[PDB]
Amino acid sequence: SLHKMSMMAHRVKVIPYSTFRLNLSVTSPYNADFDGDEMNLHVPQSEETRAELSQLCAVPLQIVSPQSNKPCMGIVQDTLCGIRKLTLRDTFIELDQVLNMLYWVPDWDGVIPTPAIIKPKPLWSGKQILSVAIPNGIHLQRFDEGTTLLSPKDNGMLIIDGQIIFGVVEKKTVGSSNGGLIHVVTREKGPQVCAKLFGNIQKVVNFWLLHNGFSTGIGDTIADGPTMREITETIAEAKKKVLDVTKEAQANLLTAKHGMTLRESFEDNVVRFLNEARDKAGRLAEVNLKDLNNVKQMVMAGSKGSFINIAQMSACVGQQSVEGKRIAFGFVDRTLPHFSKDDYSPESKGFVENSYLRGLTPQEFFFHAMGGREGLIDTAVKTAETGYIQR
Amino acid sequence: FIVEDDESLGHKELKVRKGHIAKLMATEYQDEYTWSSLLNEGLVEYIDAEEEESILIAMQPEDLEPAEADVDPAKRIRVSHHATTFTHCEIHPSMILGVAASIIPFPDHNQSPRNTYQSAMGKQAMGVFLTNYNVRMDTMANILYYPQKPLGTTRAMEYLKFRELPAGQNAIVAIACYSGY
Amino acid sequence: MIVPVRCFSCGKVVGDKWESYLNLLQEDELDEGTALSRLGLKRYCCRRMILTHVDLIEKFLRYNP
Amino acid sequence: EEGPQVKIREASKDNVDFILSNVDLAMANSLRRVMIAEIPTLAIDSVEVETNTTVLADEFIAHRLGLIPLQSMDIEQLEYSRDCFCEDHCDKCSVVLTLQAFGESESTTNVYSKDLVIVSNLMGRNIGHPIIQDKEGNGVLICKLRKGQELKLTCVAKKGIAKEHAKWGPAAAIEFEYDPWNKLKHTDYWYEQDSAKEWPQSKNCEYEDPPNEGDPFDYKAQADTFYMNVESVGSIPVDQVVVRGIDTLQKKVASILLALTQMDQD
Amino acid sequence: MNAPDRFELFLLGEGESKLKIDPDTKAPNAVVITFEKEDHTLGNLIRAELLNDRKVLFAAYKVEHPFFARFKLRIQTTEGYDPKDALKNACNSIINKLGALKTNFETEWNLQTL
Amino acid sequence: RGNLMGKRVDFSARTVISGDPNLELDQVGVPKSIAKTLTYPEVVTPYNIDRLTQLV
Amino acid sequence: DESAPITAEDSWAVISAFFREKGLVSQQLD
Amino acid sequence: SNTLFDDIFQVSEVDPGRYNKVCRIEAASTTQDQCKLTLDINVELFPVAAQDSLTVTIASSLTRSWRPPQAGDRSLADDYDYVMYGTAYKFEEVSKDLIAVYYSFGGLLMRLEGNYRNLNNLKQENAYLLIRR
Amino acid sequence: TLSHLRRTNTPIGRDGKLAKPRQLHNTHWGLVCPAETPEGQACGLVKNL
Amino acid sequence: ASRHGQKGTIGITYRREDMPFTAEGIVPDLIINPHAIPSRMTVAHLIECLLSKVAALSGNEGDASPFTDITVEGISKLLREHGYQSRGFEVMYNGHTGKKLMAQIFFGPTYYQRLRHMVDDKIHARARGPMQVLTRQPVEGRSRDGG
RNA sequence: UAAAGACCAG
Ligand SMILES: [Mg+2]
Ligand SMILES: [Zn+2]
Ligand SMILES: [Zn+2]
């Protein structure tokens, strides 16, 4: 418990089954997952004690936090990844559903709103009904990349009088971001009204997703046949760039950059060459994945995953490291007894060329290991030291 | 595995040969040429860390022995065996692992640490720890009602008796979003 | 550890097929993949059901009182 | 004939591949559920154990006995112990089987679904007969015993449905598909290059008219025709798994009216 | 240990009622019917039919929370027309269509071999 | 530090948690088992005599 | 050709043989 | 109950940047030379190929609960084959005396330009867009 | 049980959450498992043959 | 938890009728969230499935050993040779409405383990219970009914 | 009841 927020007041709801059930958006603050975490509850015993709980530390009250003058709770996982799709221009909802989606919003004025499309088939749009959860008097504008009061890319965000006018709704809008829909609805309508907004947005977007469905599979870790060739070579030549500077330093034809050793200077290049390789190597894949690829679809929502991932899973893992330098020579002048002394090639100091879809070679595997085992340590230390600092 | 280039007929080459092999699988069906054999017939020896320092090793027996005369754009990407001083060959890489990891399917496809995790959990899984559970009087013990040998497996489980005393079940799994629960 | 009466996932009984299956195996010498199919086990849920069971009980019986 | 209609293609003792058409996905689905979860059935639901020298545990064995399918033809003329007036149970609401096995042989003696011996009066009606489809006529291997291992039970089957528990489901599995040529666009095939090439065509494509590229999207479209395949476990005749389903769902909608009346009084 | 008796999914408890009908005040001539011990099976069905009677302005339904075996149905109709009736109708239709279905399935069944 | 700056306390409960998309943001589903253990001392006021008597 | 090379799958044979003699608890015993 | 704008445009070009069921189109007026148009169109309910004779009409009428059909026999100002509903957000003044207003139909945008709906084209929500051919 | 019988220990010098040992060493290849070591506290100090 | 550091606890259970299904009747026993993938990049999970869906249909011990020549392309080909999508995905319908799920879903067998640590072995509440002797404070341990 | 220890959860 290192937050005022790691302890908040809640309303009791007695229910069956043996678990403490809690709303997702309140997840982060406590920093809990459901992989087995437990949580404790304390019941106030006096009339004024409860008053102190309800009036001062109620979850609604804790939404926008001083910790960094911004909300500390936003929309996540399902609801998030799902609210994006519901929004996309393409996404239209037809009457039978729209009617349910509307009923779910506990506040709804019970006023089926005029369809955005009346012509052949009466149709409603994501934004359109998602807007039924957003209350009146909420004004929001963003402008991301090529946004232009007619955002071609459906960028940014423009909400007027509590109606989404344009732009896809994702992390930047309904997350715990600054100008955030949440940061605004709170300051603008109350801690109590914003608490209700989470519920609503979720009950809608959630329900909707339940029916649209959503998944993920290896099929999403696969890169277009040639995009792979285009990667294999990119790794390759970048390997050349190294053998080059590698001989150019064995000949003694190099300039020791003021402050560095010829040696230090050598590696620093090597490394940065291999990295730059991986990055574009990956970025190749990144662009090659249609906006249908789920993994890419989650990175877009801002619900999970990011570049490096798509990269390491489809293109190339990248140089494994320890204490900074590439894998050292535990054995005399070498990294493993499967190598000849004095080898500084990428495959010897720890460059995992393959992607996770392809699979690491006994060497890639064992170096990737040494790399990993380093974080697990650091983790199990930066945790005990931080604690005392905290104290 | 020893390499000794000692091949009249050609280059360097693993002492052990396709004959020895078939001669062992011969001793298998009999359930007289064991392991201690491959050892005393100077075909395979023990190497501690100290010694290992002064030896060269090959990963695959084949892949790291013929000359050169394309490749599958689906398989991984191995380097090469442009080495001649090979003194030994690896009986098999997968043996770098231990009892825990040997049950991880495709560990060479996971993020390094994830395998460290699973390596920890399996020691908290349920199954059948000994077929005589019925006659033992230990405090606390868990037996899985219907153990199932796992579909995807490992050549090493074969020795950890994992198919015999499994510790899980092949569940039909859907990776989807649903009620949102 | 005895054959599962009925398949977890879908419901089809499978309690009987054990002996049959174990027979189309050592005698009629067919390969598992087919044997199952012969036994009417179409879809993989019921299919993995038999193909994976470890009949431990047989060892359990080899004990005594 | 009049409204919704069938076209039973294949058919047997354990299946009914048919083509229910001219209905509502909604209604097709409801039927689909009811078959899976609310059709009465007879199942062992109580097990007294006098002796068990088996290698398996009391509740282990009981679990299975309840899984063993029982003849539920005239189930609809057996009352629910809850409803019946007998302090506990009787022949008017329950079947009582017996089971006894002894390691007689000098070699692993088996125990089968068949070995259950009804002991209550069935007041003449198809109920409680361990359903056997097994070749040798044994059905479901309950368990095995060595030398002098014994086992003396007593089971009491009672009525019941799938909701209360799975052992009351006569369902087993239920195929269900519709619009095999994605026309209603109720999906969005995932793909790498060509959706059509990459996604297997269903045997149901034949029984229906292909796309025809040129043509514009048919928005007025609607879901008619559902290719369903209702299996069965035996507790009840495949055909019945369907009728009784149609019939129950029917009673359900019924009560809503009925109750919606007792309400009118005030 | 905190597991409610499975039979609670279908047996009304002490003094509960399948139906409970409360008038929606938000909008004119509309109602909310609470079905006790009933899930989608009967909810999405009654919701569908009602969507055909065109003297029905609005109609949806939901399962407030999954632990609980009940759901709500909201129905709204063109003035004068009482929704309670609309529900009755939409209900009857369901059965008729269902009776037909039964019939047709047996007729078609008899004409079989195997 | 162990008995005063912090201590074990009464009226507390702990157990595995799990998300639920059907609870308002500020609620917390509490297992009945636990609700039947943790109590609150309400004082008999005419405002609740009836209710309280019912609970008793 | 009882003296031909050795493929990959052939290594398993060696191993099958290793554990037959030594066994998983080798060291704790010896 | 009346109208606010009428004309016929010819689509200079249609476009779907990753939009399987929607296309933003742009056409020119067949009268005023200064009248341009930008519009997102559900090209599933109404396809539109490059350079067609489209009749873009605005106006607001023939909002309280939206009622399904009923109007099987009612006022059907739908004498077209595409009628959206939405709102106008900004009324940008493209220099000169060339005013341009933007309209959003629940995510489907539009931009008009010219200058002769001086006391015509509202600045309100009201706005059924209509099209034909 | 198997994994428990192939377990290794290594004492430290108190504090010593330094990581010079805990780290997966090169020489460890083939003799110890690169993945199976406990988390936190005695991470890396407990190896598995 | 599966065998990939992919652990989790149940959050509810559904019956066949409510569960999402394939037109073939098959339905899941477990439904894990797509999100538990990207970040942890535990690809082996995904593979084990495709390999097992095949191995189950073919009754051939699916080999998932460390370093070998099996590839996702190879398995994919074998799976197509059975009538199923070659990447796993299968179309499914929402048990509630019966309507199809706009998205296809990765779907197949996967070996899952039942770790110890079950709720009713942890759940604990106290309200005024036994006290220590020295400090006269609440005792320690769910076992001793402490606070 | 109270110690000291090992193992283990997030
Ligand atoms: Mg956690
Ligand atoms: Zn099955
Ligand atoms: Zn009775």
Short mmCIF file of C-alpha atoms in Angstrom, two decimals, chain D:
data_model
loop_
_atom_site.label_atom_id
_atom_site.label_comp_id
_atom_site.label_asym_id
_atom_site.label_seq_id
_atom_site.Cartn_x
_atom_site.Cartn_y
_atom_site.Cartn_z
CA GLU D 1 -47.50 -26.79 -44.55
CA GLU D 2 -48.09 -23.63 -42.42
CA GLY D 3 -45.13 -21.88 -40.75
CA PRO D 4 -41.53 -22.91 -39.81
CA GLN D 5 -40.44 -26.04 -41.65
CA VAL D 6 -38.11 -29.00 -41.64
CA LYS D 7 -36.35 -31.09 -44.27
CA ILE D 8 -34.68 -33.84 -42.27
CA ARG D 9 -31.70 -34.86 -44.36
CA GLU D 10 -29.85 -37.78 -42.72
CA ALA D 11 -31.20 -39.51 -39.59
CA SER D 12 -30.63 -42.39 -37.22
CA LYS D 13 -30.76 -43.69 -33.66
CA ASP D 14 -28.22 -41.12 -32.48
CA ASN D 15 -28.60 -38.18 -34.81
CA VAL D 16 -30.96 -35.96 -36.76
CA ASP D 17 -29.28 -33.78 -39.35
CA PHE D 18 -32.18 -31.64 -40.54
CA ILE D 19 -33.01 -28.31 -42.10
CA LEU D 20 -35.26 -26.13 -40.00
CA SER D 21 -36.27 -23.23 -42.25
CA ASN D 22 -38.62 -20.27 -42.32
CA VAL D 23 -38.15 -19.31 -38.66
CA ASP D 24 -36.19 -16.79 -36.63
CA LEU D 25 -32.54 -17.15 -35.72
CA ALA D 26 -33.81 -16.12 -32.29
CA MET D 27 -36.28 -18.98 -32.18
CA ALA D 28 -33.87 -21.43 -33.77
CA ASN D 29 -31.41 -20.61 -31.04
CA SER D 30 -33.89 -20.92 -28.22
CA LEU D 31 -34.76 -24.39 -29.49
CA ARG D 32 -31.05 -25.06 -29.64
CA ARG D 33 -30.64 -24.17 -25.94
CA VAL D 34 -33.68 -25.98 -24.54
CA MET D 35 -32.47 -29.19 -26.14
CA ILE D 36 -29.16 -28.72 -24.44
CA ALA D 37 -30.43 -27.70 -21.02
CA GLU D 38 -34.11 -28.09 -20.00
CA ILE D 39 -35.52 -31.44 -21.13
CA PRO D 40 -36.32 -33.68 -18.13
CA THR D 41 -34.46 -37.00 -17.78
CA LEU D 42 -33.78 -39.75 -15.25
CA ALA D 43 -30.32 -39.85 -13.65
CA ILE D 44 -28.80 -41.50 -10.61
CA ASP D 45 -28.84 -38.76 -7.88
CA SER D 46 -28.18 -40.58 -4.64
CA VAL D 47 -25.78 -43.34 -3.77
CA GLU D 48 -25.55 -45.18 -0.49
CA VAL D 49 -22.41 -47.17 -0.05
CA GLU D 50 -22.40 -50.22 2.18
CA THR D 51 -19.10 -51.54 0.96
CA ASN D 52 -16.25 -50.42 -1.28
CA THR D 53 -12.86 -52.16 -1.33
CA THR D 54 -12.27 -50.66 -4.77
CA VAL D 55 -9.19 -48.75 -5.73
CA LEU D 56 -11.47 -45.77 -6.37
CA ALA D 57 -13.10 -43.56 -3.74
CA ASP D 58 -16.76 -43.49 -2.76
CA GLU D 59 -17.56 -40.11 -4.31
CA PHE D 60 -15.36 -40.92 -7.28
CA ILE D 61 -17.62 -43.85 -8.09
CA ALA D 62 -20.82 -41.96 -7.28
CA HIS D 63 -19.92 -39.14 -9.71
CA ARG D 64 -19.87 -41.63 -12.53
CA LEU D 65 -22.99 -43.53 -11.56
CA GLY D 66 -24.77 -40.23 -12.03
CA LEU D 67 -23.12 -39.83 -15.40
CA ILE D 68 -24.46 -43.22 -16.56
CA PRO D 69 -27.40 -42.59 -18.94
CA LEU D 70 -30.70 -44.20 -17.90
CA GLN D 71 -33.83 -45.05 -19.88
CA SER D 72 -35.98 -41.90 -19.80
CA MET D 73 -38.83 -42.61 -22.22
CA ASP D 74 -41.74 -42.34 -19.84
CA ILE D 75 -39.81 -39.85 -17.78
CA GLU D 76 -42.67 -37.42 -18.21
CA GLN D 77 -44.83 -39.63 -16.04
CA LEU D 78 -42.52 -39.75 -13.04
CA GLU D 79 -42.77 -36.85 -10.61
CA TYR D 80 -40.06 -34.63 -9.21
CA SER D 81 -39.21 -35.78 -5.68
CA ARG D 82 -39.60 -32.13 -4.75
CA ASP D 83 -43.21 -32.24 -5.94
CA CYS D 84 -44.10 -35.77 -4.86
CA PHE D 85 -45.65 -36.04 -1.37
CA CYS D 86 -43.53 -38.82 0.07
CA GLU D 87 -41.32 -37.89 2.99
CA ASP D 88 -38.17 -38.22 0.82
CA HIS D 89 -38.87 -40.59 -2.14
CA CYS D 90 -40.86 -43.46 -3.68
CA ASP D 91 -41.82 -45.43 -6.79
CA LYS D 92 -44.01 -42.53 -7.79
CA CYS D 93 -40.94 -40.35 -8.28
CA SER D 94 -37.83 -42.54 -8.28
CA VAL D 95 -36.14 -45.65 -9.64
CA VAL D 96 -33.89 -47.60 -7.35
CA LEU D 97 -31.03 -49.61 -8.77
CA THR D 98 -28.62 -51.95 -6.97
CA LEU D 99 -25.01 -52.74 -7.66
CA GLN D 100 -22.73 -55.45 -6.39
CA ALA D 101 -19.37 -56.75 -7.60
CA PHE D 102 -16.82 -59.22 -6.22
CA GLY D 103 -13.31 -60.04 -7.34
CA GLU D 104 -14.23 -63.62 -8.09
CA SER D 105 -12.00 -64.18 -11.06
CA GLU D 106 -8.30 -64.56 -10.50
CA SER D 107 -7.98 -61.75 -12.98
CA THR D 108 -9.35 -58.19 -13.00
CA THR D 109 -13.15 -58.38 -12.69
CA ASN D 110 -15.03 -55.52 -14.41
CA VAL D 111 -18.20 -53.66 -13.32
CA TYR D 112 -20.64 -52.36 -15.94
CA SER D 113 -23.51 -49.99 -16.55
CA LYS D 114 -25.44 -53.21 -17.18
CA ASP D 115 -24.79 -54.60 -13.66
CA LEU D 116 -27.29 -52.18 -12.16
CA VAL D 117 -30.40 -54.07 -11.06
CA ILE D 118 -33.59 -51.98 -10.76
CA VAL D 119 -35.32 -52.79 -7.48
CA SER D 120 -38.30 -50.49 -7.21
CA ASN D 121 -41.60 -51.08 -9.02
CA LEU D 122 -41.67 -49.26 -12.34
CA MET D 123 -45.46 -49.25 -12.18
CA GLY D 124 -44.99 -50.48 -15.74
CA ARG D 125 -43.17 -47.77 -17.71
CA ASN D 126 -39.90 -47.31 -19.62
CA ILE D 127 -37.56 -45.89 -17.03
CA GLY D 128 -34.26 -46.57 -15.31
CA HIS D 129 -32.81 -49.17 -17.66
CA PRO D 130 -29.07 -48.49 -18.03
CA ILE D 131 -28.88 -47.41 -21.67
CA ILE D 132 -26.48 -49.68 -23.53
CA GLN D 133 -25.23 -49.21 -27.11
CA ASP D 134 -21.91 -50.96 -26.49
CA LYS D 135 -21.12 -53.86 -28.86
CA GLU D 136 -20.67 -56.61 -26.25
CA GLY D 137 -23.79 -55.26 -24.55
CA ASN D 138 -22.06 -54.04 -21.40
CA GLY D 139 -22.16 -50.23 -21.58
CA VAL D 140 -20.05 -47.78 -19.53
CA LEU D 141 -17.31 -49.45 -17.51
CA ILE D 142 -17.96 -48.25 -13.96
CA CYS D 143 -14.84 -49.71 -12.41
CA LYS D 144 -12.46 -52.63 -11.84
CA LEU D 145 -11.42 -54.86 -8.94
CA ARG D 146 -8.63 -57.29 -8.09
CA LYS D 147 -8.62 -60.32 -5.71
CA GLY D 148 -11.23 -59.91 -2.97
CA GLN D 149 -12.29 -56.36 -3.72
CA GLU D 150 -16.02 -55.88 -3.17
CA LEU D 151 -18.55 -53.09 -3.76
CA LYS D 152 -22.16 -52.85 -2.53
CA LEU D 153 -24.22 -49.76 -3.41
CA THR D 154 -27.79 -48.61 -3.93
CA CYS D 155 -28.77 -45.84 -6.30
CA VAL D 156 -31.83 -43.65 -6.45
CA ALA D 157 -32.51 -42.00 -9.77
CA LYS D 158 -34.70 -38.94 -9.71
CA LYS D 159 -36.08 -36.66 -12.45
CA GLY D 160 -34.29 -33.42 -13.28
CA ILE D 161 -32.76 -31.19 -15.98
CA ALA D 162 -29.48 -29.94 -17.39
CA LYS D 163 -29.53 -26.67 -15.51
CA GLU D 164 -29.56 -28.41 -12.09
CA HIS D 165 -26.70 -30.47 -13.45
CA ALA D 166 -25.11 -31.82 -16.59
CA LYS D 167 -25.90 -35.47 -15.99
CA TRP D 168 -29.51 -34.60 -16.82
CA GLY D 169 -28.70 -33.43 -20.30
CA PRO D 170 -29.79 -35.77 -23.10
CA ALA D 171 -28.13 -33.30 -25.46
CA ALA D 172 -24.52 -34.44 -26.04
CA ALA D 173 -23.73 -31.88 -28.77
CA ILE D 174 -25.66 -29.81 -31.26
CA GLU D 175 -24.50 -28.67 -34.65
CA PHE D 176 -25.87 -25.37 -35.85
CA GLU D 177 -24.90 -23.18 -38.84
CA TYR D 178 -26.56 -20.72 -41.22
CA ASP D 179 -25.78 -18.46 -44.21
CA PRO D 180 -22.73 -20.60 -45.22
CA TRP D 181 -22.01 -18.14 -48.02
CA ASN D 182 -21.38 -15.08 -45.83
CA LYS D 183 -24.16 -12.97 -47.39
CA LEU D 184 -25.74 -11.35 -44.36
CA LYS D 185 -22.16 -10.32 -43.64
CA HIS D 186 -22.64 -11.48 -40.06
CA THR D 187 -18.85 -11.99 -39.98
CA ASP D 188 -15.60 -10.61 -41.33
CA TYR D 189 -13.21 -13.40 -42.26
CA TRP D 190 -9.69 -12.98 -40.96
CA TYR D 191 -7.06 -13.57 -43.61
CA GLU D 192 -3.54 -13.28 -44.97
CA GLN D 193 -4.25 -12.98 -48.73
CA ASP D 194 -7.59 -14.39 -49.85
CA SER D 195 -10.37 -14.95 -47.35
CA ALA D 196 -12.25 -17.30 -49.68
CA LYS D 197 -9.16 -19.42 -50.41
CA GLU D 198 -8.07 -19.49 -46.76
CA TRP D 199 -11.39 -20.29 -45.10
CA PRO D 200 -12.83 -23.84 -45.66
CA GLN D 201 -16.24 -24.04 -47.30
CA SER D 202 -18.91 -25.92 -45.36
CA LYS D 203 -20.79 -28.97 -46.60
CA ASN D 204 -23.75 -26.64 -46.22
CA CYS D 205 -22.67 -24.44 -49.13
CA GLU D 206 -24.17 -26.86 -51.63
CA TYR D 207 -27.67 -26.76 -50.18
CA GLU D 208 -27.62 -23.03 -50.95
CA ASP D 209 -27.19 -20.55 -53.81
CA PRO D 210 -23.66 -19.11 -54.37
CA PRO D 211 -22.76 -15.36 -54.15
CA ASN D 212 -22.36 -13.89 -57.68
CA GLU D 213 -19.88 -11.03 -57.36
CA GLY D 214 -21.51 -8.40 -59.58
CA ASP D 215 -24.62 -8.12 -57.38
CA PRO D 216 -24.81 -5.33 -54.74
CA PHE D 217 -24.94 -6.08 -51.01
CA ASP D 218 -28.41 -7.25 -49.98
CA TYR D 219 -29.13 -5.28 -46.82
CA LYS D 220 -32.79 -6.27 -46.54
CA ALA D 221 -31.36 -9.78 -46.05
CA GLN D 222 -32.45 -11.92 -43.08
CA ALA D 223 -31.60 -15.25 -41.50
CA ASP D 224 -33.76 -18.16 -42.67
CA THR D 225 -32.75 -21.77 -42.83
CA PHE D 226 -30.63 -23.30 -40.13
CA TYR D 227 -28.68 -26.47 -40.68
CA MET D 228 -28.85 -28.25 -37.36
CA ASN D 229 -27.63 -31.67 -36.22
CA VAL D 230 -29.07 -32.79 -32.86
CA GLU D 231 -27.11 -35.77 -31.48
CA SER D 232 -28.19 -37.82 -28.45
CA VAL D 233 -26.95 -39.90 -25.60
CA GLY D 234 -29.79 -42.35 -25.56
CA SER D 235 -31.64 -41.37 -22.41
CA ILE D 236 -34.13 -40.30 -25.01
CA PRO D 237 -34.82 -40.98 -28.79
CA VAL D 238 -33.01 -38.49 -30.99
CA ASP D 239 -36.29 -37.39 -32.53
CA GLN D 240 -37.63 -36.73 -29.04
CA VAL D 241 -34.61 -34.63 -28.03
CA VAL D 242 -36.10 -32.31 -30.67
CA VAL D 243 -39.82 -32.60 -30.02
CA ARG D 244 -39.56 -32.63 -26.29
CA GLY D 245 -37.34 -29.62 -26.78
CA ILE D 246 -39.93 -27.90 -28.95
CA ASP D 247 -42.50 -28.98 -26.42
CA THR D 248 -40.74 -27.72 -23.31
CA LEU D 249 -39.84 -24.35 -24.83
CA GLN D 250 -43.52 -24.29 -25.65
CA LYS D 251 -44.58 -24.84 -22.03
CA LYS D 252 -42.12 -22.16 -20.96
CA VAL D 253 -43.71 -19.50 -23.14
CA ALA D 254 -46.96 -20.93 -21.83
CA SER D 255 -46.48 -20.15 -18.17
CA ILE D 256 -45.62 -16.58 -19.02
CA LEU D 257 -49.17 -16.21 -20.31
CA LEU D 258 -50.67 -18.14 -17.44
CA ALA D 259 -48.86 -16.18 -14.75
CA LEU D 260 -49.64 -13.03 -16.75
CA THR D 261 -53.24 -13.94 -15.92
CA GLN D 262 -53.27 -14.92 -12.23
CA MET D 263 -51.91 -11.40 -12.09
CA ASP D 264 -54.95 -9.84 -13.81
CA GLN D 265 -57.20 -10.83 -10.87
CA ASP D 266 -55.96 -7.79 -8.97
#
